[PDB]
């Protein structure tokens, strides 16, 4: 109502119910909006974000809508810290979910996780929206086991320079193609590369990519044209798909539409 634009939520409409933990922007909570509707509430720690730029971008993000993409409901910006209000994902981050051996996943479930993410990424690609830090740690799982892509584009607004470039100690080296590590060339094809690494994370039940190497050693390995190798749970057909994401030449990597088609073909063949 009065005093709030379409991208703005009135924080007075929030009830806080459970803490979900802390990330590099600070705390995240589960709660209700206007008594009834489940939401997650990400509270942005002071000094961590380029806030005015993020708020303008939130307007764009409000217009993104896909069943496998975490939905932004709005932001609370009149106060500090500012809040990001989203759809609630009850089963938490995909990385931790994969590492819980009790799930005893079938490979058909792992392929479905890959398909969920691929659908979201195909949608983002159709909107010429880059994720810029796709990884299992960024994906979330809902109470139905569906995986959704989260934190899309958010790295653009992080002020901690340890996160923002390769020469940084917290940059996602292990999800980056050679042209990003060598020249900072981001594109649709760097999201493709990262998706391949994510498929490897899924099929490896959440192992760290290049687990015996440091980031510096990983960058060398990649630069010399070497790659991750096949997880035990991946069939040769699944491995072919993830490996196609790692062509040295960016232009030879598939699109998300093509990857989706390839994933559906394998599901059909492995059903």
Ligand X SMILES: C=CC(=O)N1CCC(CNc2ncnc(N)c2-c2ccc(Oc3ccccc3)cc2)CC1
Which residue numbers belong to the known binding site for ATP? 20-28, 42
Q: Which long-range contacts (CB under 8 A, 24 or more apart) does 156-164 make?
A: 156/50, 156/53, 156/57, 156/132, 157/49, 157/50, 157/51, 157/53, 157/54, 157/57, 158/24, 158/48, 158/49, 158/50, 159/47, 159/48, 159/49, 159/50, 160/24, 160/48, 163/24
Residue 11, Cβ density class (10 Å: 0-12 exposed, 13-18 middle, ≥19 buried): middle
Q: Is residue 208 within the footprint of Cl ion (CB under 5 A)?
A: no
Which of 137, 174, 189, 253 is close enough to bind ligand X by CB under 6 A? 137
Q: Is residue 42 within the footprint of ligand X (CB under 6 A)?
A: yes
Q: Is residue 92 within the footprint of ligand X (CB under 6 A)?
A: yes
Q: Is residue 143 within the footprint of Cl ion (CB under 5 A)?
A: yes
Which of 119, 151, 191, 201 is close enough to bind ligand X by CB under 6 A? 151
Q: Is residue 140 within the footprint of ligand X (CB under 6 A)?
A: yes
> Does 143 participate in catalysis according to the annotation?
no
Q: Is residue 77 within the footprint of ligand X (CB under 6 A)?
A: no
Q: Is residue 142 within the footprint of Cl ion (CB under 5 A)?
A: yes
Which CB sits closer to ligand X, 59 or 185? 59
Annotated binding site: 20-28, 42, 86-89, 154
Which of 75, 89, 134, 219 is close enough to bind ligand X by CB under 6 A? 89
Phi, psi dihedral angles at 243 (to 5 degrees) = -70, -30
Helices (H) then strands (E): counts for the chain: 8, 7
The SS3 call for residue 148 is strand
Q: Which does 23 bind (CB under 5 to 8 A by kind): ligand X, Cl ion, none?
A: ligand X
**Residue 160, C-beta contacts closer than 8 angstroms, at least 6 positions apart:** 24, 48, 170
Q: Is residue 72 within the footprint of ligand X (CB under 6 A)?
A: yes
Which CB sits closer to Cl ion, 141 or 242? 141
Q: Which does 173 bind (CB under 5 to 8 A by kind): Cl ion, ligand X, none?
A: none
Contact of 9 with 74, CB cutoff 8 Å: yes
Both tokens of residue 26? 């600070």
**Which of 60, 80, 61 is CA-nearest to residue 72?**
61
| CA–CA gap between residue 125 and residue 133 (Å, rounded) | 14
Subset of residues 169 to 228 that bind ligand X, contact rule: CB under 6 A? none
The SS3 call for residue 23 is strand
Which of 7, 33, 54, 88 is close enough to bind ligand X by CB under 6 A? 88
- Name the minimum Å distance from CB 28 to ligand X: 4
Which CB sits closer to ligand X, 151 or 254? 151
**Which of 73, 13, 70, 76 is CA-nearest to residue 43?**
76
What is the number of the residue whose Cβ is closest to ligand X? 93
Identify the active-site residue in 116, 133, 151, 191: 133
Residues with catalytic roles:
133
Residues near ligand X (CB under 6 A): 20-21, 23, 28, 40, 42, 70, 72, 84, 86-89, 92-93, 95-96, 137, 140, 150-152, 154
Residues near Cl ion (CB under 5 A): 89-90, 142-143
């Amino acid at each position: 109502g009065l005093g709030y634009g379409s991208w703005e939520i009135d924080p007075k409409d929030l009830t806080f119910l459970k803490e979900l933990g802390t990330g590099q922007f600070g705390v995240v909570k589960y709660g209700k909006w206007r008594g009834q509707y489940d939401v997650a509430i990400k509270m942005i720690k002071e000094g961590s974000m380029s806030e005015d730029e993020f708020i303008e971008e939130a307007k764009v993000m409000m217009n993104l809508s896909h069943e496998k993409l975490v939905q932004l409901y709005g932001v609370c910006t009149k106060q500090r810290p500012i809040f990001i209000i989203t759809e609630y994902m009850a089963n938490g981050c995909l990385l931790n979910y994969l590492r819980e051996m009790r799930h005893r996943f079938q490979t058909q479930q792992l392929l479905e996780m890959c398909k969920d993410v691929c659908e979201a990424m195909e949608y983002l690609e159709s909107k010429q929206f880059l994720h810029r830090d796709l990884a299992a740690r960024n994906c979330l799982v809902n109470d139905q086991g569906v995986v959704k892509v989260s934190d899309f584009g958010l790295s653009r607004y992080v002020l901690d320079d340890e996160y923002t470039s390769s020469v940084g100690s917290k940059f996602p080296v292990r999800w980056s193609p050679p042209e990003v590590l060598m020249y900072s060339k981001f594109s649709s094809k760097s999201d493709i590369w990262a998706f391949g690494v994510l498929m490897w994370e899924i099929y490896s039940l959440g192992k760290m990519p290049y687990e015996r190497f440091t980031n510096s050693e990983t960058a060398e390995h990649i630069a010399q044209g070497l790659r991750l190798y096949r997880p035990h749970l991946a069939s040769e057909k699944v491995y072919t798909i993830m490996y196609s994401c790692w062509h040295e030449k960016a232009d030879e990597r598939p699109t998300f539409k093509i990857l989706l088609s390839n994933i559906l073909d394998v599901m059909d063949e492995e059903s």
